[PDB]
Amino acid sequence: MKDFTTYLSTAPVVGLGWAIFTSGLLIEINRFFPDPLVFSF
Amino acid sequence: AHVVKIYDTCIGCTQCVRACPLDVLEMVPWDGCKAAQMASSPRTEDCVGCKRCETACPTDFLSVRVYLGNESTRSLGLAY
Amino acid sequence: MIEAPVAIGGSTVALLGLGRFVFLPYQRRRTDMEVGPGKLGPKTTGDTFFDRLQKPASFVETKSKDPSGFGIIDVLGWGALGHVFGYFLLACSSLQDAGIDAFPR
Amino acid sequence: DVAGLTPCSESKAYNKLERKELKTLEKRLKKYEPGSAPYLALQATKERTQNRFKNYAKAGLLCGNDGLPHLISDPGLALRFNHAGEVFIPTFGFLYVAGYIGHVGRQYIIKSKEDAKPTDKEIILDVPLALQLAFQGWAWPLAAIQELRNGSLLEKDENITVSPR
Amino acid sequence: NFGIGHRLEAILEAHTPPAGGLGAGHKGLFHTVNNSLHFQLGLALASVGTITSLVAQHMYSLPPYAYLAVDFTT
Amino acid sequence: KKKEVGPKRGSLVKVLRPESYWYNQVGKVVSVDQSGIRYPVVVRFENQNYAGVSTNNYALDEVTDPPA
Amino acid sequence: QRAGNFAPGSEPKEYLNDLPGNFNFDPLELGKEKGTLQRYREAELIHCRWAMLGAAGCLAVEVLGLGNWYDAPLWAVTGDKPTWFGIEVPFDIATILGVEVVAMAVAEGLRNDNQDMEKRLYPGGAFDPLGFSKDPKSFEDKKLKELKNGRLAMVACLGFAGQHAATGKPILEALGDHLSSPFFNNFATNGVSVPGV
Amino acid sequence: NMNGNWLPGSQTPAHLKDLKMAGNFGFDPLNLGAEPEALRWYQQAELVHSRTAMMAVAGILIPGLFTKLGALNVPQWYEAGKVYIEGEGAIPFGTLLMSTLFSYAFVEGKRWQDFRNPGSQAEPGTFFGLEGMFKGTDNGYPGGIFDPLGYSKTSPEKLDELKLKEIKNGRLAMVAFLGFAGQYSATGKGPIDNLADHLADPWHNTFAENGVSVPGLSAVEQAAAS
Ligand code: CLA
Ligand code: CLA
Ligand code: CLA
Ligand SMILES: CC(/C=C/C=C(C)/C=C/[C@@]12O[C@]1(C)C[C@@H](O)CC2(C)C)=C\C=C\C=C(C)\C=C\C=C(C)\C=C\[C@@]12O[C@]1(C)C[C@@H](O)CC2(C)C
Ligand SMILES: CC(/C=C/C=C(C)/C=C/[C@@]12O[C@]1(C)C[C@@H](O)CC2(C)C)=C\C=C\C=C(C)\C=C\C=C(C)\C=C\[C@@]12O[C@]1(C)C[C@@H](O)CC2(C)C
Ligand SMILES: CC1=C(/C=C/C(C)=C/C=C/C(C)=C/C=C/C=C(C)/C=C/C=C(C)/C=C/C2=C(C)CCCC2(C)C)C(C)(C)CCC1
Ligand SMILES: CC1=C(/C=C/C(C)=C/C=C/C(C)=C\C=C\C=C(C)/C=C/C=C(C)/C=C/C2=C(C)CCCC2(C)C)C(C)(C)CCC1
Ligand SMILES: CCCCCCCCCCCCO[C@H]1O[C@H](CO)[C@@H](O[C@H]2O[C@H](CO)[C@@H](O)[C@H](O)[C@H]2O)[C@H](O)[C@H]1O
Ligand code: SF4
């Protein structure tokens, strides 16, 4: 497990996790707020 | 021909001579290093400038230096 | 309009008086650290024709018969400045009498 | 009405662009039966287009001679004409997030350089430490200016590698 | 060679800001410019390039020659 | 010879050689030659150079204590 | 020897210790060099005297009801005749600019050729006819008073310039507006000095 | 020691564990107060923001409570400036803004000067002979005419208790004013009106019932009610 945990601790795995998290956050924001351009409320 | 210059920072590790593909360098006795060896270039007219001696130098910066210029038949590596 | 002789003559006389009696004490002290002997001073030895052509001639610094150091080179420079100022005043007056107002209203 | 730009609500070409987009959406919509998934998708697209065109209006947006909205750039001019949220506030938010990222990376670099073999920590991330620094960077500008004040933000030039002249 | 004028080296020596803002200032630059032809070459080419860019940016907006604005290809 | 020619072995030193890769950098003293060679101070660095090496020889005048 | 402090508790300046009119100041550490400090001292003194002259002119042109200082040289624009208290002196702009240029040229050339730092600061002699500068204590007190009134004159000249730029009202009408309607007429009610009020 | 723990079972930061500080609860998860001078600046900032908070919250609540009872007829806080600008004898907005901003500039310059050098406002012959009482006692507690009734001239334990009470009501006032702004932006009514709505109908009137506070909750409610 700790060998597997250090494998997930490697740079490409945490990079993939960050990319998935950021892409999902931005996609859900754009879906639930369709076409945001002007900062108004 | 090219110019091969060797400074006092050489440690006499003989790596530049082994990496030389045309037998330009040599080792002479010396007192400025622990190994009591110093690189020399008595056959600099046969050097082509391949900089293989500089690749094998372990000291920081370079204890051996190759300067190009005035290419000849032997310096251009021509078999014709 | 302003007549040309009175304006030009007054401008050049005032500029020459400022050169001789006013700016001359300030002169030869701005050239003290400019072409002085303590610094590089002369710029050419004067060996060949071009080198001695770089060398100053014996006409601008031979003597100063004026009580001050006002040589004829300074006379020419201050007279040129006076002619410039007089022609500037004449030009401004000429633009003024033509019915054109260049000043901000 | 600044920079010779009409507001989107009072504009003319903005309405032409809106009608053109609604017209091509309706032309695509008429090719499907009302009780179909492509019909619902095209209706949702038309609703999103109408909502976007309505929300771009009544927000101070300006467009000039083409109906395409323009963004007022200069602060002060944007502040006094209700255009601060166009670019003045988005760069403030971006500066906050970028400073968050930079401060978190700086903290990770400094805390990872202490132990033996820091390159291993660089290439094999300490995930609990990275997540702890991730949730501790909400006050990045205060910490950054305080390290600037105490001098730990900057390194002396005597200790920095310098290329030969 | 006359008794009046300005020495370039003296102007370069004098224009050193106080309180060590520019260190030694512009001192020693006269011999640097005069001895090095490449310094003058770079300065001349930079100024002439800036002037050429100015010519390009000002000829089209301010046509100095008659019937030049109508000639679009020219 | 009294004391030693160079610094204490294992102590941190700062390289003042401008042409060296590790100029204004801190390294560890491995050995100092007592024979009297030109560059007796052997310094090992954590960060390797472009050639991949991490040890070098320096003279007495190009090594000082690291500032704090 | 210190004349006071512009902010009680600021860090003192060692070089700004024995200078006349020492109110510490200098937050930007300007003029740390002694020669630049002396140049700043003499420049501040002559700016003080010029601001004194200008403030006196602007006040005296208005307390006598002779017009604004802004429209005072307007006779040059309109081609009218110059006036001074009503004398109606017969001079033209050609015969005014030239004489002013040459007179202040000889004046500033004689001032610049002093070659004495204290005399550049305070020449005395022919410029001190009555001469209350004989006693050093009264000399120091009058130096401090001159510096204070000169700084007040500089800020007054800046105030006159800014007030006439923001509003067309003259000096005395602006003063009467500030006393008559203090909370309703000030720099914040112009709409120009403060954008958006 | 410490007054209490904001989060039991959590590791107290080292700079706040042994710190004898008034109103300390170890609430520094971001470690902002690591430096002692930075801690002093943050303490002074907290004190000024707290006094801001209670002054504003009292001025919002007590006139608001009086108008709810009907004794007073002042407006609510979000339109009082608007009606006061439109008064018949109203000073212009810019004049009041810059005048009381300049007055703030005076007191805050004095505060900055006595912070960057403690006791530096007691320089003799500076403020009309009254500058001898301008010397501050501690960080953020000047004293003198700031405490003319002498309530701080007591035992040290009573002084620490008073400081703890001051900072506790101050922090409560910060969250109260933040709530005032937030639920006026959400509901659009006064704080007393919001309290009355929560008292009359607690379930129907809350932050979660409106989509402004939590977006998308109204859609979930409509889907559940469908
Ligand atoms: C670098 C230039 C640039 C810029 C300035 C923009 C900017 C924009 N584009 Mg463009 N775009 C770009 C490059 C760029 N894009 C590129 C290269 C492409 C091609 C891939 C696109 C393709 C593209 C499309 C197809 C669309 C956009 C859209 C947008 C808008 C997105 C706004 C948004 O999502 O809401 C604002 C979103 C946020 C503020 C995100 C929130 C993040 C903060 C930090 C909060 C974090 C969330 C949470 C609260 C954090 C706490 C919880 C957490 C701990 C988990 C905005 C106007 C969309 C739009 O509406 O256009 C007008 C759109 O339709 N763009
Ligand atoms: C959709 C929105 C969007 C996107 C995708 C980007 C994308 C990018 N921006 Mg941009 N930006 C945007 C909107 C956007 N921007 C807006 C709306 C503004 C305001 C008008 C800016 C202003 C801005 C600046 C000023 C800079 C960027 C930079 C960058 C690039 C690298 C950021 C970085 O290093 O990581 C995150 C940041 C770090 C890892 C290090 C922190 C460094 C930041 C910039 C400093 C922040 C604090 C600083 C003290 C504040 C003063 C900034 C200074 C310039 C005055 C990246 C391509 C940077 C760049 O390209 O550099 C080459 C850069 O300097 N952006
Ligand atoms: C978080 C670490 C970090 C920090 C604080 C900086 C800071 C800086 N860099 Mg550097 N940079 C970084 C990472 C970082 N960089 C990486 C990973 C790369 C390789 C892509 C570069 C490549 C780079 C170049 C080529 C240049 C800079 C420059 C700069 C300066 C301008 C500010 C800026 O945003 O530049 C913009 C920076 C970028 C666009 C790089 C962004 C790279 C990724 C997207 C960010 C990495 C974040 C990191 C993974 C977070 C780790 C957190 C940890 C918990 C895991 C500033 C000193 C410029 C300079 O010299 O200015 C004086 C410059 O020319 N940087
Ligand atoms: C304001 C001023 C000087 C201001 C200086 C400042 C802010 C200095 C700033 C700093 O200190 C700080 C803040 C902090 C430090 O770290 C840095 C420095 C840099 C040291 C001078 C005005 C100086 C003003 C002067 C000299 C005014 C002269 C006026 C004259 C001659 C008027 C004449 C006439 O008005 C009449 C009488 C009648 C009219 O009809 C005709 C005319 C001709 C218009
Ligand atoms: C001064 C103040 C408000 C003043 C308002 C005023 C005068 C308003 C004026 C008026 O209303 C009146 C009076 C009456 C009306 O008729 C007119 C108007 C014009 C409407 C608020 C301060 C308000 C201050 C607040 C809310 C501060 C909050 C700080 C927080 C939450 C800090 C938290 C943390 O820092 C910790 C503690 C530790 C870290 O590790 C983590 C984080 C999260 C960073
Ligand atoms: C590498 C090198 C070199 C080179 C360099 C170069 C090449 C440079 C360039 C440079 C450049 C290329 C620059 C430019 C500049 C510019 C400028 C500086 C400009 C200015 C302008 C102005 C100032 C203007 C103003 C105005 C006017 C007049 C009008 C309108 C308005 C205004 C105000 C805007 C050399 C050789 C020296 C040598 C050493 C090294
Ligand atoms: C003899 C003598 C004398 C006398 C002298 C005199 C009297 C003089 C004068 C003089 C004058 C009285 C003048 C002069 C002048 C000079 C000069 C040198 C000039 C110049 C000029 C110029 C250069 C011009 C220019 C121009 C033109 C051409 C055109 C356009 C405009 C202008 C202006 C630019 C005496 C007795 C003392 C002594 C002895 C000797
Ligand atoms: C990753 C994080 C994402 C954000 C948090 C999680 C999602 C929370 C819900 C987000 C959406 C809430 O919805 C809120 O915004 C919508 C944005 O179009 C708006 O939606 C409303 O108005 C739109 C037109 O403008 C209509 O097309 C919608 O049918 C209508 O519901 C409303 O203002 C509100 O319903
Ligand atoms: S490779 Fe370098 S150090 Fe080794 S013997 Fe040759 S010159 Fe000397």
Short mmCIF file of C-alpha atoms in Angstrom, two decimals, chain G residues 5 7-11 182-184 186-189 194 196-197, chain H residues 90-95 97-98 102 113 116-117 120-121 123 126:
data_model
loop_
_atom_site.label_atom_id
_atom_site.label_comp_id
_atom_site.label_asym_id
_atom_site.label_seq_id
_atom_site.Cartn_x
_atom_site.Cartn_y
_atom_site.Cartn_z
CA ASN G 5 9.29 68.05 13.98
CA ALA G 7 5.78 64.28 12.74
CA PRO G 8 6.41 63.61 16.46
CA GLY G 9 8.38 60.37 16.65
CA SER G 10 9.90 60.16 13.17
CA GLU G 11 13.45 58.88 12.78
CA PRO G 182 -17.78 76.55 4.42
CA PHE G 183 -19.45 73.14 4.23
CA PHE G 184 -21.10 73.90 0.87
CA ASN G 186 -14.69 73.81 -0.90
CA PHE G 187 -12.30 71.83 -3.09
CA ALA G 188 -14.54 68.75 -2.88
CA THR G 189 -17.49 70.66 -4.38
CA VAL G 194 -11.62 65.08 -6.62
CA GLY G 196 -16.53 61.81 -8.81
CA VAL G 197 -16.67 63.72 -5.46
CA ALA H 90 -27.45 68.58 3.80
CA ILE H 91 -23.69 68.99 3.53
CA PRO H 92 -22.51 67.61 0.15
CA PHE H 93 -21.23 64.03 0.04
CA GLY H 94 -17.77 64.95 -1.22
CA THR H 95 -17.22 67.62 1.44
CA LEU H 97 -16.17 62.41 2.74
CA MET H 98 -12.93 64.35 2.38
CA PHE H 102 -8.72 64.00 6.59
CA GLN H 113 3.66 56.99 14.55
CA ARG H 116 6.34 52.30 14.83
CA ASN H 117 7.83 53.93 17.94
CA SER H 120 6.86 58.67 20.67
CA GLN H 121 3.79 60.92 20.82
CA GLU H 123 7.58 64.44 22.64
CA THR H 126 4.32 69.24 20.33
#
